[PDB]
Design an enzyme around this catalytic site. Structure first.
Site, PDB file in Angstrom:
ATOM      1  N   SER A  61       0.763  -1.255   0.000  1.00 21.90           N
ATOM      2  CA  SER A  61       0.000   0.000   0.000  1.00 21.90           C
ATOM      3  C   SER A  61       0.799   1.315   0.000  1.00 21.90           C
ATOM      4  CB  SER A  61      -1.034   0.008   1.128  1.00 21.90           C
ATOM      5  OG  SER A  61      -1.962  -1.088   0.962  1.00 21.90           O
ATOM      6  N   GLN A 117     -11.282  -5.139  -0.245  1.00 13.70           N
ATOM      7  CA  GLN A 117     -10.808  -5.993  -1.323  1.00 13.70           C
ATOM      8  C   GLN A 117     -11.855  -6.119  -2.430  1.00 13.70           C
ATOM      9  OE1 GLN A 117     -10.927  -8.153   2.083  1.00 13.70           O
ATOM     10  NE2 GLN A 117      -8.861  -9.033   2.123  1.00 13.70           N
ATOM     11  N   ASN A 149      -8.918  -0.840  -0.947  1.00 13.71           N
ATOM     12  CA  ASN A 149      -8.288  -0.988  -2.248  1.00 13.71           C
ATOM     13  C   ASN A 149      -9.277  -0.850  -3.424  1.00 13.71           C
ATOM     14  OD1 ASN A 149      -5.827  -1.489  -0.917  1.00 13.71           O
ATOM     15  ND2 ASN A 149      -6.222  -3.697  -0.845  1.00 13.71           N
TER      16      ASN A 149
END
Ligand SMILES: OC[C@H]1O[C@@](CO)(O[C@H]2O[C@H](CO)[C@@H](O)[C@H](O)[C@H]2O)[C@@H](O)[C@@H]1O
EC number: 3.5.2.6
Length: 352
Positions: A61, A117, A149
Site C-alpha cells: 500500500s 478488497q 483498495n
C-alpha cells in the site's frame, strides 16, 4: 555516514530485526536532504542472496502514494477533476447509488463503504462493472472513511482514462521516468528478476499475485535508492522541473478530510508536526470524517507517512518537510505496523 545517523539507525533496527525475525531489510534516512543507506540480511534465504541497495521489495500500500501523485498530475494536466462524478469516466456505471460519488470520494476512501478488497471471483472487466454496479453503500458519500483498495484502485484506473494510456504506461512516463526512478516497476521485467527479493510468510517464499485493481492499489516494487529519491521528491516538490508533476505532488499532500489527529491526502496521510508518537499509531475500521473545506495545501510542519504490506513484505515511509528529514523502511516480512512507526519515530526524533 555521520556517526549520529549510523548509531541511531543501527541501534534501532538491529533489535527490531531480531524481535520480528525479519529475513532482510533496507533503510534510507534523508537528512538535510541527502540520503544514507543501510541494509541487513537476506533477499533470498535459500539462495543466500543479501539485501543490497539494488534489491526490489514489494511496497504494497505504499504504492497508493504513487497512485495519488499520478492522479494529482492528471488533475494538474486538466484531464480530470476530483469534483467530477465517477460516471463521467465510467458511463456504464448507471446504478443510482453512484449519483454524488466523485473521484475525490474514490481517492480518499469516503465513497460510502467500498470494501477493502475486490473479490477474487472478479477476473474480467465485465465482472468488475458488475461488482461496482451491485455494491450497496452503507453510508452517504463524504461522511465516513473506510480504507479500501476497491476505492483508491478504481480512482487510479479512472484517472488515466482521458490520457488513453494504460495505468502502467502513465505511471512510467509521468511519474517514474521524470523522477529518475529507473528501478521502480509495476510489473518486474525479466532483466530485473535477479534483484527481486522473495517475501516470507510463515517461512514460505512468496511474491504478490495481483487480482483486479491490485496494480493501482498495491502494485509497485522498488529499491531503497529509488524510494529515497521518492521521499526527496515529496520533501521538495518545488525542485521538480515537470510543472504538472510538481503540482501533482502538492495536491497529494493536501488535507481533504480529518479523523481524530489524522488528515487524509491522496495516498499520503498526515499529522501536524510535532506529533505525539502514541497518536501516529484491526481488519476494518470505519471512522467518521470532517470535510476540510476547502482542502489545506501541503503543510510543511507535518509528519507525512504511509504503511504498506503484501503477504510477504512490510514497508513504511515517513517524512517531515519542515525539517528536510525522512525515512524509508523496506522489509521482506509483513510485521506489525506499530513496530514500524515506533522505529521510524525513534530515528527521526533523534535527528530532528
Ligand atoms: O496479472 C495482473 C492482472 O490483473 C488483471 C486481471 O484482473 O487486471 C488489470 O487490468 C488493468 C490493465 O492490465 C490493471 O491495471 C488493473 O489492475 C486490472 O483490472 C490483468 O489486466 C493483469 O494482467
Amino acid at each position: 555516514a555521520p556517526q549520529q545517523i549510523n548509531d541511531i539507525v543501527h541501534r534501532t533496527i538491529t533489535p527490531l530485526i531480531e524481535q520480528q525475525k525479519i529475513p532482510g531489510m533496507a533503510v534510507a534516512v534523508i537528512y538535510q536532504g541527502k540520503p544514507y543507506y543501510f541494509t541487513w540480511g537476506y533477499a533470498d534465504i535459500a539462495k543466500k542472496q543479501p539485501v543490497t541497495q539494488q534489491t526490489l521489495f514489494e511496497l504494497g500500500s505504499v504504492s497508493k502514494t504513487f497512485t495519488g501523485v499520478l492522479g494529482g498530475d492528471a488533475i494538474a494536466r486538466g484531464e480530470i477533476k476530483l469534483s467530477d462524478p465517477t460516471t463521467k469516466y465510467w458511463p456504464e456505471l448507471t446504478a443510482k447509488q453512484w449519483n454524488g460519488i466523485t473521484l475525490l470520494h474514490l481517492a480518499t476512501y469516503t465513497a460510502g463503504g467500498l470494501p477493502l478488497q475486490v473479490p477474487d471471483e472478479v477476473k474480467s472487466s465485465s465482472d468488475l462493472l458488475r461488482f461496482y454496479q451491485n455494491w450497496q453503500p452503507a453510508w452517504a458519500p463524504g461522511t465516513q472513511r473506510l480504507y479500501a483498495n476497491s476505492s483508491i484502485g478504481l480512482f487510479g484506473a479512472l484517472a488515466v482514462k482521458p490520457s488513453g494510456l494504460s495505468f502502467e504506461q502513465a505511471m512510467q512516463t509521468r511519474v517514474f521516468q521524470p523522477l529518475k526512478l529507473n528501478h521502480t516497476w509495476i510489473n518486474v521485467p525479466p532483466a530485473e528478476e535477479k534483484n527481486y527479493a522473495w517475501g516470507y510468510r510463515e517461512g514460505k517464499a512468496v511474491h504478490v499475485s495481483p487480482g483486479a485493481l491490485d496494480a493501482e492499489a498495491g502494485g509497485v516494487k522498488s529499491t531503497i535508492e529509488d524510494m529515497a529519491r521518492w521521499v526527496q521528491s515529496n520533501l521538495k516538490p518545488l525542485d521538480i522541473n515537470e510543472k504538472t508533476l510538481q503540482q501533482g505532488i502538492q495536491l497529494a499532500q493536501s488535507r481533504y478530510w480529518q479523523t481524530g489527529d489524522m488528515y487524509q491526502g491522496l495516498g499520503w496521510e498526515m499529522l501536524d508536526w510535532p506529533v505525539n508518537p502514541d497518536s501516529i499509531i484491526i481488519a476494518l475500521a470505519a471512522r467518521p470524517v470532517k470535510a476540510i473545506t476547502p482542502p489545506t495545501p501541503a503543510v510543511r510542519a507535518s509528519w507525512v507517512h504511509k504503511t504498506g504490506a503484501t503477504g510477504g513484505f512490510g514497508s513504511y515511509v515517513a517524512f517531515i518537510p519542515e525539517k528536510e528529514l525522512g525515512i524509508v523502511m523496506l522489509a521482506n516480512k509483513n510485521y506489525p505496523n506499530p513496530a514500524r512507526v515506533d522505529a521510524a519515530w525513534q530515528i527521526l526524533n533523534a535527528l530532528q
